[PDB]
Amino acid sequence: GPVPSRARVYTDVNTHRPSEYWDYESHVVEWGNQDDYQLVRKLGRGKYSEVFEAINITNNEKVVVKILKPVAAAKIKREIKILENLRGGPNIITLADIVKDPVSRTPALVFEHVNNTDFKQLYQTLTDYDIRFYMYEILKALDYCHSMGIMHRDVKPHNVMIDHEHRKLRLIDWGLAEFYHPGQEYNVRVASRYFKGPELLVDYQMYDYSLDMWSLGCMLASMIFRKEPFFHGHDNYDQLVRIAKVLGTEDLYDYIDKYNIELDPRFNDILGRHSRKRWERFVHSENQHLVSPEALDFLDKLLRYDHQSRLTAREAMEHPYFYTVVK
Numbered sequence: 001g002p003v004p005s006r007a008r009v010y011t012d013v014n015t016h017r018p019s020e021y022w023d024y025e026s027h028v029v030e031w032g033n034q035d036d037y038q039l040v041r042k043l044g045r046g047k048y049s050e051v052f053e054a055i056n057i058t059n060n061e062k063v064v065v066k067i068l069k070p071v072a073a074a075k076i077k078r079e080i081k082i083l084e085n086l087r088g089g090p091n092i093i094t095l096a097d098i099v100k101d102p103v104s105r106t107p108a109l110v111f112e113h114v115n116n117t118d119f120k121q122l123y124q125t126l127t128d129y130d131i132r133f134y135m136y137e138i139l140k141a142l143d144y145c146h147s148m149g150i151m152h153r154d155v156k157p158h159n160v161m162i163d164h165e166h167r168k169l170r171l172i173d174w175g176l177a178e179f180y181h182p183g184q185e186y187n188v189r190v191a192s193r194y195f196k197g198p199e200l201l202v203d204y205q206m207y208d209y210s211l212d213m214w215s216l217g218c219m220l221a222s223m224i225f226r227k228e229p230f231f232h233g234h235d236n237y238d239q240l241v242r243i244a245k246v247l248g249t250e251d252l253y254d255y256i257d258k259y260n261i262e263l264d265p266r267f268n269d270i271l272g273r274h275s276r277k278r279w280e281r282f283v284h285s286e287n288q289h290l291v292s293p294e295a296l297d298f299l300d301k302l303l304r305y306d307h308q309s310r311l312t313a314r315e316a317m318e319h320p321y322f323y324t325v326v327k
């Protein structure tokens with residue numbers, strides 16, 4: 001059987017809290033008035049929700065309305081509890097109201113306005129200074145939710161909203177977010193393909209906050225090397241092969257050895273044998289101005305197979321890469 005694993009930080013935050021904090025099923029939703037919000041335009045549709053630009057007609061302030069699809073409606077209380085627990089946190093989206101949509105008859109989450117601009121729209125355009133600045137702002141959010149005993153589990157460019165003109169950032173879509181309980185086995189079908197950690201890809205269920213640090217590392221690698229996405233798998237199996245072509249197969253076998261994981265035998269015909277690549281392999285004339293010894297050292301410490309060997313959000317914020325950022 002697999003060897004158990006525990007978070008090296010904020011391990012017991014929820015164990016010490018009263019049940020009310022993490023027992024989301026016991027939470028009683030104070031339903032608002034759906035009439036207060038007039039939908040303006042559909043911003044997008046995912047497999048679990050529909051997002052709209054809206055106006056709170058009473059105060060004329062712009063808001064964002066997220067309407068849950070029937071498939072996601074069942075986990076409404078988890079997302080509400082997390083959003084309320086984190087409200088006021090640095091760079092975390094602010095929940096303004098919870099209403100029952102009259103058409104879908106599913107819950108609708110109302111958020112204070114943030115720019116329609118995803119980080120995906122800008123992150124391949126940033127200077128060396130701005131990559132550092134924005135990565136620090138993201139770290140602020142991650143360290144805060146981790147310190148509050150929450151894992152985001154869907155860190156990706158589409159889940160970061162940016163107001164570049166006003167140097168403002170918000171970490172959004174807390175729909176897959178979960179409370180960390182030590183020893184708990186979680187669902188590996190979380191995060192988007194390109195941002196999935198090796199723990200997910202090898203089916204190791206006893207993961208923690210460090211999952212978010214891998215996802216952040218993928219985002220950094222894509223920004224500094226101008227390669228969208230950095231690990232470009234055709235499916236979840238090929239995703240592990242793409243990572244192994246960079247990090248090597250020897251450290252992957254060491255990782256699975258350490259946690260006594262049994263790799264899906266389909267990997268025997270595609271994984272092959274690969275040496276760890278030096279990061280300078282990914283440097284070229286177009287991205288060299290974004291690459292520094294500090295950036296590469298920082299990336300090296302995020303993109304590790306062993307989820308326990310990855311920098312934590314706080315340790316990441318202490319990194320020399322962030323010394324040039326005004327604090």
Ligand SMILES: Nc1nc2c(ncn2[C@@H]2O[C@H](COP(=O)(O)OP(=O)(O)O)[C@@H](O)[C@H]2O)c(=O)[nH]1
Nearest residue numbers: 048049071072073074075076079175176178187
């Ligand atoms: N509240 C909410 N739930 C979501 C959202 N996206 C996904 N979900 C739900 O999250 C579930 C997956 O989370 P998970 O922890 O794996 O739950 P499990 O299937 O019960 O193990 C999906 O089945 C959806 O119901 C979202 O945006 N909001």
